[PDB]
Amino acid sequence: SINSRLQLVMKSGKYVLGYKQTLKMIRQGKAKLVILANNCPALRKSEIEYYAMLAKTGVHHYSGNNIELGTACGKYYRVCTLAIIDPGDSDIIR
Amino acid sequence: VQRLTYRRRLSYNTASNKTRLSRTPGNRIVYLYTKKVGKAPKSACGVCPGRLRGVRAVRPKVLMRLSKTKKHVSRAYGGSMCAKCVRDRIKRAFLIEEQKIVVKVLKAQAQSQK
Amino acid sequence: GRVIRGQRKGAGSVFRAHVKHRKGAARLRAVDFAERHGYIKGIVKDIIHDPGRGAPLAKVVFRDPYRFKKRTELFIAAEGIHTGQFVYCGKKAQLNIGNVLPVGTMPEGTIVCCLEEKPGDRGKLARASGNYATVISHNPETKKTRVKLPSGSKKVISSANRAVVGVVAGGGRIDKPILKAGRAYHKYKAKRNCWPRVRGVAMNPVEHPFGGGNHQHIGKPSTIRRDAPAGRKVGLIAARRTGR
Amino acid sequence: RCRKNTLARRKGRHMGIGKRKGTANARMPEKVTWMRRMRILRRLLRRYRESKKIDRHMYH
Amino acid sequence: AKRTKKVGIVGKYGTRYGASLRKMVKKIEISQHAKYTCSFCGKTKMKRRAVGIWHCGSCMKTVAGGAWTYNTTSAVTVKSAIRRLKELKDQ
Amino acid sequence: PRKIEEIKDFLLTARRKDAKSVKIKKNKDNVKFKVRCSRYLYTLVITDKEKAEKLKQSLPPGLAVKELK
RNA sequence: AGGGCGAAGCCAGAGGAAACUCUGGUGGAGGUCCGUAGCGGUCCUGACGUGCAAAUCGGUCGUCCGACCUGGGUAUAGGGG
RNA sequence: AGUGCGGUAACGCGACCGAUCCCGGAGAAGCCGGCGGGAGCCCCGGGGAGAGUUCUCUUUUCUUUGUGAAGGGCAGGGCGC
RNA sequence: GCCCUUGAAAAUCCGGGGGAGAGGGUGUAAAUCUCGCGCCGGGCCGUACCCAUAUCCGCAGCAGGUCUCCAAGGUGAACAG
Ligand SMILES: [Mg+2]
Ligand SMILES: [Mg+2]
Ligand SMILES: [Mg+2]
Ligand SMILES: [Mg+2]
Ligand SMILES: [Mg+2]
Ligand SMILES: [Mg+2]
Ligand SMILES: [Mg+2]
Ligand SMILES: [Mg+2]
Ligand SMILES: [Mg+2]
Ligand SMILES: [Zn+2]
């Protein structure tokens, strides 16, 4: 499961939550992975999906809706897009 | 106190018969009849509830008088559509066409395979 | 004596329908090559309220396939429709909700509404609010389909004639009590002059056949022929059985 | 003559139980009295915060 | 039960209309005024606009739903059946 | 009406074909110069008195120069 | 007009192991109450009763955000509306 | 070469070619509550000009004390930019 | 906030997408949903006064009826008296 591996990333690794910030992380070429909630707007997703394709970056569609993902980042707010810059000691990146 | 009367034969207080008080140089409070409140145009997108920027919200039969620059804005879809909905239309219309090309490529490979 | 309230509703006049603010008819798209052979795609531009109607409607806009021109329709909203959704329709339409396709295509047990009673009629059966029909069974030759209507009846139908998949939106309206007479008044005012209704027992015997008496009673049987001249046909018409 | 009497009303006069006809809430509406208070105390709080007297979390 | 023991929303109606009706209204009267979650953004803003039509204020997604609930049960059960049959047809 | 800010500009407006009366209001502390045209009544505020007295001479062919009192 | 009652939602504090409950606020619901204009028209079986009036007057009354009141336009005509 | 240019951008600048065709907007929206801003009026403290009172008291009490539209500037509101 | 109430049409006016066309050939052109200025025109009918305890309708200068706008000080919850 992905929730478990994220937990560790959020604890120990470096990361960034949200679309304005993750698109800046990909555009820098630092972002190693991009998680998308399922409810994300369709235009947004396809835009991000293209940005990863240009930057040769992983894109993982999360199983849950943006409330679940934010819950799954350990935040009381809700996150639709999340980039993983440096995982701490997790194998979120395979 | 100076009470006052309407200045036109329309007695009834209506959408048409709206007023305001004004002190003249003669030093008498007088009714002036007021012009209706114009609205800025809403977006062609139709989801963005907020009305458009950089347009003189004025009663539509005035627009006639106004200069072109007042009536619009320097952009593609200028003064017809909000920016956000343009820069989403743009990248949408682009990203869509890139996938149409990808499906065309996957179709052509499948023809060459078969 | 008098022409009774009831006979009078036929002359229209006061008892005609109130239709200023009504947003239009709630049809289906008309058939054409695209509908007939493939599937035309349109988008749901908005969902609307239509006075005197419990079902909400849906401005659905297509592209006319002959003139450069964006034609638009008023579908009755299938429940779970929303804006910025696409609404495909035709023979080769995908069997998902808010998607109008011929009854002959769609499998058995398939729930539909705004279902064409006769091919090309533009959507006549099951278009109320919480209502729908179910496609029972197909006869491939004869090109006919059996459909179970909300009344219970199991009507036979041409397999060509279309329907929107899914039930009608705004269901369970009638679970809420009205309470206030006022609330009744406000319902029928956006419809037609049919409300505060006076019982024929109340009336003098010139304006209704139950009228008169020293006691508010009917006096004759309240069941009645339907070979009955208009003016008597009052109470329970052709009532097969009458009680609880 | 009025002006003189209004000056009496300032001193706190002709204002006892037996010269009131309206309810207390009519005379000074409780809502308005509340509105004043919030608009005071809140104004005091955000002045304190914006002088670094009190921190974010205290303020809240 | 701060202000009322057992009327809540239907305390507006006062004594009127009878106990059963007012109890019967309390169910709907609650649900219809409820703010639901917009399964589109995920904010709690789905609010009935008029009968059978619910609007997210943020999402701006108007959504044909039930008369007093964003979803009827009927609609939900119909949805799943259609999805099942769709899969049965195409494979 | 229209206020003007350059002594030259008012001189150019006064020199048009459409113009006529160029009345002059000594307000004390101000000395305006109101020159009527077809459409607008142009005015020009000239705070100095000697500069106003100088301009007085600089209007051209025999216009009204109907000084106001 | 102006008042009264103070429904949902919201805040804090206190208790509760939880479920949740109490206390103080805020909030302003309603074919809600009082009560003006308005609309009406209970009683005095008052006045008047060759009247002011071919139905009026006085006090007293009902209602006063709603099946509210109301101008103009428009529809329905005689065994018909 | 030349169917204007500025701003990261919201957008800006006095003008800035253009048909049938198409899309959109404005015209074009219920009632009720609360709160806020702007005026008119009222109020208060004073300046003046004219009044009335003055047996005693009263720096008195009373009146009056202005700037149209249209432009330009600037507050002051608002913004789901 | 309320609605099993969701609360006008059209004339007219503008914006945008498109890009069929048009412009002159190195001092000018076509172009100004033209910017600033300049010139000429805007016909037809209504326009007195009353608008109500005396200009209206109730046979009358009839205690009846008849749609609106403006709306000072004091007392007072108050457009109550
Ligand atoms: Mg008019
Ligand atoms: Mg502009
Ligand atoms: Mg009777
Ligand atoms: Mg009979
Ligand atoms: Mg009597
Ligand atoms: Mg007598
Ligand atoms: Mg008399
Ligand atoms: Mg006159
Ligand atoms: Mg009068
Ligand atoms: Zn938009």
Coordinates of C-alpha atoms (C1' of nucleotides) in Angstrom, one line a residue, chain I residues 49-78:
Chain I
rC49 C1' -55.9 74.3 -13.8
rC50 C1' -58.5 71.0 -10.1
rC51 C1' -56.7 66.0 -8.4
rA52 C1' -60.8 66.6 -3.5
rU53 C1' -64.8 67.7 3.5
rA54 C1' -66.1 73.0 -3.7
rU55 C1' -63.2 71.5 -10.7
rC56 C1' -63.6 63.5 -10.7
rC57 C1' -68.0 59.4 -9.6
rG58 C1' -72.1 58.8 -6.3
rC59 C1' -79.1 63.5 -9.6
rA60 C1' -75.9 68.5 -5.7
rG61 C1' -70.1 72.7 -3.4
rC62 C1' -73.4 65.1 -0.5
rA63 C1' -69.7 63.0 6.5
rG64 C1' -69.4 58.0 0.9
rG65 C1' -65.9 56.5 -2.9
rU66 C1' -61.1 57.4 -5.8
rC67 C1' -53.7 55.2 -7.6
rU68 C1' -48.8 57.9 -5.9
rC69 C1' -44.2 61.3 -4.4
rC70 C1' -42.1 64.8 -0.4
rA71 C1' -42.5 64.6 4.9
rA72 C1' -39.5 69.5 10.3
rG73 C1' -39.1 70.3 16.6
rG74 C1' -40.7 68.4 21.6
rU75 C1' -42.4 64.0 24.5
rG76 C1' -42.0 58.9 23.6
rA77 C1' -40.5 52.1 21.7
rA78 C1' -42.7 54.7 17.9

